[PDB]
Amino acid sequence: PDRFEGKVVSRKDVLNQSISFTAGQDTFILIAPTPGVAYWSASVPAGTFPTSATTFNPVNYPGFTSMFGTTSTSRSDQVSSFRYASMNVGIYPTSNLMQFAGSITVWKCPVKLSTVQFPVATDPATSSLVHTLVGLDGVLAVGPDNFSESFIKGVFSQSACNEPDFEFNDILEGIQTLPPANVSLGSTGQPFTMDSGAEATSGVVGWGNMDTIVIRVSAPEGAVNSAILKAWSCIEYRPNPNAMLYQFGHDSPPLPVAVIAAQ
Amino acid sequence: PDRFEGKVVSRKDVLNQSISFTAGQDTFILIAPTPGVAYWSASVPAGTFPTSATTFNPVNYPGFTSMFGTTSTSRSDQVSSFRYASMNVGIYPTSNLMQFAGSITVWKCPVKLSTVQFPVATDPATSSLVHTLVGLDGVLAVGPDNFSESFIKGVFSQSACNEPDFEFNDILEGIQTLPPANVSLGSTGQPFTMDSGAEATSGVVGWGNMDTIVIRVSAPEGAVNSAILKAWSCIEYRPNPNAMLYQFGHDSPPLPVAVIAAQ
Amino acid sequence: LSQPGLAFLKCAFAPPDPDRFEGKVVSRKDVLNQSISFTAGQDTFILIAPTPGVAYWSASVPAGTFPTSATTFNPVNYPGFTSMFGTTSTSRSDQVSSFRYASMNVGIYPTSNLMQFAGSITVWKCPVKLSTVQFPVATDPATSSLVHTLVGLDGVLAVGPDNFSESFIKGVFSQSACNEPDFEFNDILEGIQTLPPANVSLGSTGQPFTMDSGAEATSGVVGWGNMDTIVIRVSAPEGAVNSAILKAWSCIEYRPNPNAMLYQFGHDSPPLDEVALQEYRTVARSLPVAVI
Amino acid sequence: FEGKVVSRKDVLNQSISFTAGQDTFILIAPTPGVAYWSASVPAGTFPTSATTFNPVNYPGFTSMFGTTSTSRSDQVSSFRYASMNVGIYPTSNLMQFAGSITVWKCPVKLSTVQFPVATDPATSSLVHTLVGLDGVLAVGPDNFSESFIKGVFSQSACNEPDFEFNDILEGIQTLPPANVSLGSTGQPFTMDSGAEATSGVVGWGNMDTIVIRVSAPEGAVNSAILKAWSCIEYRPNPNAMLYQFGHDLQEYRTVARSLPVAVIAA
Amino acid sequence: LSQPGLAFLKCAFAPPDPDRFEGKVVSRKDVLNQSISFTAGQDTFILIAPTPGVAYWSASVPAGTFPTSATTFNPVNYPGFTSMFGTTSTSRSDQVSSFRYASMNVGIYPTSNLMQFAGSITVWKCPVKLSTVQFPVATDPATSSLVHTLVGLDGVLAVGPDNFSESFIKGVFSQSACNEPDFEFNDILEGIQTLPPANVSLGSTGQPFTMDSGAEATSGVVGWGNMDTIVIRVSAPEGAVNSAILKAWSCIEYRPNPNAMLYQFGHDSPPLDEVALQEYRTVARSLPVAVI
Amino acid sequence: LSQPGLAFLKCAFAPPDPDRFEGKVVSRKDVLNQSISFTAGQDTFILIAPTPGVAYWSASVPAGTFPTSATTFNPVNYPGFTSMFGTTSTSRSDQVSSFRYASMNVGIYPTSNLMQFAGSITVWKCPVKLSTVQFPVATDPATSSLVHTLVGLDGVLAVGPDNFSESFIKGVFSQSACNEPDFEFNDILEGIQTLPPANVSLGSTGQPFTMDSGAEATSGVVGWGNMDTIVIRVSAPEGAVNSAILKAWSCIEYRPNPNAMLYQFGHDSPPLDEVALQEYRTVARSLPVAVI
């Protein structure tokens, strides 16, 4: 809640994902303030942090095509702006009691979007400006303020909102790759590649002023371990008048890091 | 409790069912406001939602033939009307601690009875009207407001009553198949077939103004997993004078989605 | 208990002795009279169903028994049926659209002499409701069907336990009530002159006996009210002369449709009298199954 | 009740012209998805059995209800009205205006009827039945009768004692339905939706119907901007795209009783 | 001027602003509304005849003229015709038997703009009465016959001298009265859908023009009241847009017949208010032919 | 409500009828006037965007429709554009650096006669914001690019539901507000005479229509305010004369730069009036979409 009371649209972003990861891997999980793309993951060969060769893969939230279009110039056709209030992560294992081996680690990372520049020798030679997600460097090493537990219990947690009053950005259209197309990875300062993938299926529409919780699921070999993954997100939307979203609209009213999955 | 105080009949619908499902399946469970038929299930090949080929199978509550007759024109021979107050589902595993693999998911679905029509070219050509259970479409995809946990702990939950004052329907006699006999599945708008089965053994007698809890028991292969299933239902009945039910009669007096099975 | 409140109560409780809704409703004082005789060796049931236009009917079964499939028997009309329900089966919607019942109150006042009467008046309750039933029929191609049916009629096939069973000269007087807790509308049906309808066999619906109507312009059932059907048995054994003057006094709250001149007789429904709810929801069941 | 429901302010905004020399009705009905209901007849006379009828949808009718006879189940389960209201605003100048606007209420409902069916083997059958459109067949005595140049504005209220969630019934194409004779039903006139991909009747609310009579005379250039909106509550299905947007007194009925039939739009 | 007396007067004189008989009479407040348009170059007469069910009719004749034999034109109904007068020509007696008129009061309130209107409203009086006429017809054997006819219709063929003739935008408002000195019954006729009836030629009765009715169940004339027929002329010349909202408000004292539920809306007629006779028999003719 | 507080309110709410920051801010009373005519058979939209220098613009689309890609249409200037924003595209920073909006308030006061007007004024809301969009372009070597784009313009392609739609003679009067809860700065952009910029195709940004500016020294967009863009539609059908006197009155709180003489007209911003926050954050949305 806040001091503003205009026409807003509330939404609950409740994700069901059964997951089954390969043994001998390092399943790494980001839950970032990315609207419509509730989940972010990659796998790296075991024991190690993400590297330069880490090509990243999202999954979308169910029903993403409906309220953000299909095309990279179509990401703001129903909403003009949004906000954030809370996100939740939840991992609950679906595994029996003798094969297991592994650990689950949870800290936060302050990742934010930024603009890095570089000159390009064209004819005539110019310079440009691309988006980049700074802060991502902190993922690559051990954050001390973290959670630490084995695999077999699980973990539940919630994020936080890094602003005194709850101000807001806009939808940033266009973004399909981070760094963008024809721009090299080492030029920006991104150590690992971020990618959305197929244009019509998903994509980054924007960003919010939140913490990003990061999960290091450690998995040794010989331990078949499956779970459900659960993402909640207290997501707001400011709609457009042409959009159908107006018959949901009403006015807005005037714990440590993590715990285990059994509360 | 409510403002009415006529001659009512209380009943507790307490069901014991040990269950043992096939590995590599998707055991799907409905607990719908269907009097005398406490339980509703089907199995689909693994990983998937119900499809068009889903032929559905009930089990009855013990002692159904006694107070609802035997024949499709005999479903209101002891009670003329009823109500609903609460239902409970309970799953408690009977499985040891190393073979298991699986997950349990619980949301609600608002399913209600409706009447779809279609013209039939007879001689002379007419039109008709059949019953259908709309709302069932929401079962076929992931509801966000849900419960999420592995198999090994279990789940207990209770339903809710979707009406401000507790009004009521009637017993709808006749129903043995949903869609009825000689009516095609795709004509109505039912994606998956609902069936009661053998007439004398069971059958749909009516419907109540309740939520319907739905359970997606996920089961990978190689994991023999058995449980008890427990249905409670706070069921009311308004009897008939010819019925024997009158020596039970007295006057009526003037939590989030689910939790795990260990409270 | 405001000024409409006891006026609602005297409409409800004893014409011989609302809620948060404030629309333009019409209140008919249904006041009916029959001087009617019975026949010896002939069990005469009576049914007071919540059916607007038909405040009354008596059913007849041979002595010491209960109705059969062949027990197929008629309505009467409280007068006002040609006026407020038209003449054809697609004409009942012309005046009114839905109805409510405040109460129907029945009383039987005998006029027989003290030297001839024999038998009993036996009164109990039957919660009769209108439902549906489906069944496939052979057609081209084969199809399903769906017609109305009355559930709760099965209860009429035996004497109710909570009853009132005295001599024929003592008379009887009874009250009904709205068994569902708010005064719910019931939209007026049409085309109903046959329950079960034409080309439909008994035993395929579940009704043990038949409500007929006969002629189109003179009788018929237009809908169903949220009221329990009062049932009265007079057995009338062999050797007795059996006549009485019967009463059927009802209060009906109609919802009309802007055609026909009636509306001025109705007024806007009075606002809530929340206290006077408690007088209706206490006294009616405090009164027994029946009285004298 | 307090559960997961959808609030959807549904608005139709359009200008409109009126046909000169003809009597033209507009029915503000509780038929969600469809914005309003209109047809025209010759001036001074009244719609008959030979009078056809038409829908005008809200924007986004196929988006929330699908396109077919097996599509209206998909997104919302049951619904209920709270407050819907219409406003006509004049756009004819001082040099051409003629005719008037007369407003009265009509409490119509949706019921069933039976009829005998003459087949072999014969049965009976039941079709849906608009009960109360007989009440539309005159001018009700509760009148807001006023010449076009001042306009009109009026609200309704729930005609039920409190409220019910009314289900979305599915498969309505015409009222009376297709393959069914009008004379066996008893409706005054046929209420069509056309091709179902364009338009359809998806259910019935706990509201009355507001009928306005505008009969523009001959040579009368009659035109207006029509504003009709509604406040509808939905119970959605969990698979729906509408489901994410969902969320969880006495003075309303004092407004409902003391309201005039309409008010001047100025 | 007792409490029913001014209530009779406000029924009589201006709903916009009895005698020694004390029976159970029913008082309908006939309140009618039409938003109706005219046509340019077309003289529209209006007739307000004392006919229960038909409070209103406008007749149409081409410009600058008067009706012919071919001027054969219809009724409308004030709503309430299917309810209180049945559907068939032998069914009008089902509800009511005779009627009385307290008053009928007409008013025309125009809604046209100030830049287009042209023409006039011309109002006068026509004492129209229902009579008989006999004439022999060739039959086997030759016979006489006897049918109804309306006398006083001859007066409609010209503008009355005592009139009220102003612009179209000014409107008009008028009152009628009972020209015979006590409130006499008039028994309700039936079978009348054609005046003159079928197989009867104009010129053989004396009517210069025809009252038709068309369909049986939707319109008709049921009787005649002891009231003068108010006649209103609108000429509507070439070049003008011509629309108005018209009023026909009447007070009718019915005599019903014990069938149909209506009776409770009526009450026993109040006793004599001999003083308040003088207020009705002075003010009505003190009001002119018409006002604004 | 201190002395600057209602002075802030009368600046905010109706010039026809702050916070914890206390810097040397300059408050221009943006007061603009246009006597402007429309054209028949031609839908004239109006856009009031939060753009300093451009208080107003009307967009034009053929009858009964919505804008296309070819709908490419201009600004005007409230006077003061050459003075406070220079003449070249790299000269807008010369006077001021950032700006705030207290309110902009629009009103349309028609001057047409009562015998000719036809059409409507239709007003709703469009939350338009300035965003970015990236896309790769073929260069040597191949590169990416990044230019501005306006999001929320998609909303203009249809009539808003919460609207105000009356006749053309009735006029309209409206208010805006700051949709984000504190008065945030917006730094002044430069080089913007083309939205989308040169060599950039529509459909590659997402804007369905084009904001142009034309000449460099006479018009341009300098930034964006945290205000919703008020949109007004006048459809202007065939046959009507369509002229009006329009109002655009705005309050702008500038942040200047120590060059140019202006500063003495501005003063230090007054200290907090925490109560008077509640008067601004209650009354503005209590006022509707639009009034007369």
Q: Provide the 10 A C-beta neighbour count for residue B29.
A: 20
**What is the C-alpha separation between E17 and C260, in angstroms, rounded?**
25
B205 Cβ contact list (under 8 Å, min separation 6): B34, B35, B36, B37, B68, B75, B76, B171, B172, B173, B175
Helix (H, G, I), strand (E, B) or coil at E154: helix
Distances (CA, A) of D231 to A248, D36, D227: 10, 14, 14
**What is the C-alpha separation between C97 and A150, in angstroms, rounded?**
68
Name the minimum distance, in Å, from the CA of A229 to any CA of chain D. 19
Residue B200 in contact with residue B74, Cβ under 8 Å? no
Residue C210 in contact with residue C195, Cβ under 8 Å? yes
Residue B17 in contact with residue B25, Cβ under 8 Å? no
Helix (H, G, I), strand (E, B) or coil at B202: coil
Q: Provide the 10 A C-beta neighbour count for residue A115.
A: 12
Backbone angles phi, psi at A158, to 5 degrees: -140, 155
Burial C15-45 (b: 16+ CB within 10 A, else e): beebbbbbbbbbbbebbbeeebebeeebbbb
Find tokens 């007396």 and name the residue: E5
Q: Would you tell me the crossing angle of helices E274-286 and E3-12 to the nearest 10 degrees?
A: 20
**Tokens at E184, concatenated:** 């006499």
Element (H, E) at A210: none
Full domain range(s) for residue C212? 1-292
Nearest to D161 among C19, C146, C256 (CB): C19
Q: Provide the 10 A C-beta neighbour count for residue C274.
A: 10
**Do B and D share at least 3 CB pairs under 8 Å?**
yes
When scoring D110, D131, D164, D252 by the number of chain C Cβ atoms within 10 A, the one with the most, hence best to mutate, is D131
Which of F17, F19, F30, F228 is an active site residue?
F17
**Tokens at D114, concatenated:** 């039976």
- Tell me whether residue E154 is annotated as binding: yes
**Do F and C share at least 3 CB pairs under 8 Å?**
no
CB contact under 8 A, D151 and F161: no
**What is the C-alpha separation between A28 and A56, in angstroms, rounded?**
10
Chain E contact partners (≥3 CB pairs within 8 A): C, D
Helix (H, G, I), strand (E, B) or coil at E51: strand
Helices (H) and strands (E) in chain F — how many of each? 3, 15
Distances (CA, A) of F216 to B250, C181, F190, F209: 89, 75, 11, 21
Distances (CA, A) of F290 to F108, F175, F204: 11, 7, 35
CB contact under 8 A, B3 and C181: yes
Find tokens 């090493």 and name the residue: A141
Neighboring chain D residues of B108 at a CB cutoff of 8 Å: 238
**What is the C-alpha separation between F193 and F214, in angstroms, rounded?**
7
**What is the C-alpha separation between C239 and D252, in angstroms, rounded?**
65
**CATH number for the domain harbouring residue C279:** 2.60.120.20
Computed on alpha carbons and rounded to an integer, the radius of gyration of chain C in Å comes to: 20
Residue B178 in contact with residue B56, Cβ under 8 Å? no
Single-letter amino acid code for the residue at E186 = N
Name the minimum distance, in Å, from the CA of C86 to any CA of chain D. 12
Neighboring chain A residues of F135 at a CB cutoff of 8 Å: 72, 174, 181
User: Taking CA atoms, what residue in B is nearest to C278?
Assistant: B3
With 0-12 CB in 10 A as exposed, 13-18 as middle and 19+ as buried, what is E141?
exposed
Chain C contact partners (≥3 CB pairs within 8 A): B, D, E
B122 Cβ contact list (under 8 Å, min separation 6): C139, C140, C143, D119
Neighboring chain B residues of D1 at a CB cutoff of 8 Å: 162-164
DSSP characters over F139-195? -SS-EEEEEEEEESGGGGGS--SS-EEE-SSS-EEEE--BSSSS---EEPP-S-S-B
Q: Provide the 10 A C-beta neighbour count for residue E114.
A: 12
B263 Cβ contact list (under 8 Å, min separation 6): B156
Nearest to B127 among D70, D177, D244 (CB): D177
**Tokens at C259, concatenated:** 């055609």
**CA C103 distance to own-chain centroid:** 10
List residues in chain D touching C: CB distance below 8 A: 104-117, 119, 121-126, 129, 131-132, 134-142, 159-162, 183-186, 250, 253, 256-257
**Tokens at F117, concatenated:** 């007007």
Strand partners for B131: B115
Q: Provide the 10 A C-beta neighbour count for residue B9.
A: 21
Residue F277 in contact with residue F18, Cβ under 8 Å? no
Annotation: binding site of D for Ca(2+): 74, 134, 162, 164, 186
User: Taking CA atoms, what residue in C is nearest to B124?
Assistant: C140
Bridge-based pairing state of the strands C72-73 and C210-211: parallel
**What is the C-alpha separation between E254 and E268, in angstroms, rounded?**
12
E3 Cβ contact list (under 8 Å, min separation 6): none
**What is the C-alpha separation between B162 and E62, in angstroms, rounded?**
67
Strand partners for A36: none
**What is the C-alpha separation between F33 and F48, in angstroms, rounded?**
14
**What is the C-alpha separation between C55 and C30, in angstroms, rounded?**
8
Helix (H, G, I), strand (E, B) or coil at A157: strand
- Tell me whether residue A2 is annotated as binding: no
Single-letter amino acid code for the residue at F227 = M
Distances (CA, A) of A252 to A83, A236, B208, D7, F126: 12, 10, 35, 14, 18
Chain A contact partners (≥3 CB pairs within 8 A): B, D, F
Q: Provide the 10 A C-beta neighbour count for residue F146.
A: 16
**What is the C-alpha separation between D131 and A218, in angstroms, rounded?**
68
Residue E91 in contact with residue E85, Cβ under 8 Å? yes
**What is the C-alpha separation between E11 and E30, in angstroms, rounded?**
10
3-state helix, strand, coil in chain A (%, to 5): 5, 45, 50
Bridge-based pairing state of the strands F210-211 and F72-73: parallel
DSSP characters over chain C? --HHHHHHHHHHS-S----S---EEEEEEEEEEEEEE--SSEEEEEEE-SBTTB--EEEEEETT----TT-EE-----S-HHHHH-SSTT-GGGTEEEEEEEEEEEEEEE---TTT----EEEEEE--EEEEEEEEE--SS-EEEEEEEEESGGGGGS--SS-EEE-SSS-EEEE--BSSSS---EEPPBS-S-BS-TT--TTSS--SSEE---STTT-------SBPEEEEEE---TT---EEEEEEEEEEEEEE-TTSGGGGGSEEPPPP-HHHHHHHHHHHHHS-S-B-
**What is the C-alpha separation between D166 and D201, in angstroms, rounded?**
14
Q: Would you tell me the crossing angle of helices C274-286 and C3-12 to the nearest 10 degrees?
A: 20
Helix (H, G, I), strand (E, B) or coil at B246: helix
Nearest to C259 among D109, D135, D253 (CB): D135
Please, what sign has the CA dihedral across residues F140, F141, F142, F148? negative
Nearest to C80 among E29, E87, E260 (CB): E260
Strand partners for A234: A12, A86
| CA proximity to D245, closest of D236, D232, D258 | D236
Q: Provide the 10 A C-beta neighbour count for residue B28.
A: 22
User: Taking CA atoms, what residue in E is nearest to D144?
Assistant: E33
Q: Whats the size of chain A, residue-wise?
A: 263
**What is the C-alpha separation between F2 and E273, in angstroms, rounded?**
72
Single-letter amino acid code for the residue at F58 = S
Helix (H, G, I), strand (E, B) or coil at B104: strand
Report chain breaks in chain A, C–N > 2.5 Å, as residues after which they occur: 254
DSSP characters over F229-273? EEEEEE---TT---EEEEEEEEEEEEEE-TTSGGGGGSEEPPPP-
| CA proximity to F249, closest of F174, F168, F186, F184 | F174
With 0-12 CB in 10 A as exposed, 13-18 as middle and 19+ as buried, what is E190?
middle
**What is the C-alpha separation between A261 and A155, in angstroms, rounded?**
4
| CA proximity to F58, closest of F71, F70, F41 | F71
Is E17 an active-site residue?
A: yes
When scoring D1, D5, D76, D179 by the number of chain B Cβ atoms within 10 A, the one with the most, hence best to mutate, is D179
Find tokens 């009709």 and name the residue: D228
Report chain breaks in chain E, C–N > 2.5 Å, as residues after which they occur: 17
Name the minimum distance, in Å, from the CA of A14 to any CA of chain D. 9
Annotation: binding site of C: 94, 154, 182, 184, 206
**Do B and F share at least 3 CB pairs under 8 Å?**
no
| CA proximity to A239, closest of F63, D60, B146 | D60
Computed on alpha carbons and rounded to an integer, the radius of gyration of chain E in Å comes to: 20
User: Taking CA atoms, what residue in B is nearest to D179?
Assistant: B126
Distances (CA, A) of F229 to C214, F49, F125, F156, F224: 71, 5, 6, 10, 10
Assign residue B154 a region: left if phi > 0, alpha if psi is -120 to 50, beta otherwise?
left
CB contact under 8 A, A98 and B98: yes
Burial A191-221 (b: 16+ CB within 10 A, else e): bbbbebeeeeebbbbbbbebbbbbbbbbbbe
| CA proximity to B210, closest of B30, B84, B28 | B84
Element (H, E) at F281: helix F274-286
Helix (H, G, I), strand (E, B) or coil at B245: helix
Residue D171 in contact with residue D178, Cβ under 8 Å? no
State the count of interchain CB pairs (< 8 A) between A and D. 37
Bridge-based pairing state of the strands C172-175 and C42-48: unpaired
Single-letter amino acid code for the residue at B31 = I
F285 Cβ contact list (under 8 Å, min separation 6): A5, A6, A251, F177
Nearest to C82 among E79, E258, E260 (CB): E260
Name the minimum distance, in Å, from the CA of E286 to any CA of chain D. 30
Assign residue F86 a region: left if phi > 0, alpha if psi is -120 to 50, beta otherwise?
left
Longest CA span, chain C = 67
Neighboring chain D residues of B109 at a CB cutoff of 8 Å: 237-238
Experimental method: cryo-EM
Domain count, chain D: 1
Residue E168 in contact with residue E121, Cβ under 8 Å? yes
Residue A51 in contact with residue A136, Cβ under 8 Å? no
The DSSP code for D243 is G
Nearest to A128 among F129, F143, F152 (CB): F143
Single-letter amino acid code for the residue at F35 = S
**What is the C-alpha separation between A188 and A52, in angstroms, rounded?**
13
Q: Provide the 10 A C-beta neighbour count for residue D263.
A: 15
- Tell me whether residue F180 is annotated as binding: no
Report chain breaks in chain F, C–N > 2.5 Å, as residues after which they occur: 17
User: Taking CA atoms, what residue in A is nearest to B145?
Assistant: A14
With 0-12 CB in 10 A as exposed, 13-18 as middle and 19+ as buried, what is C165?
middle
Burial F229-251 (b: 16+ CB within 10 A, else e): bbbbbbbbbeebbbebebbbbbb
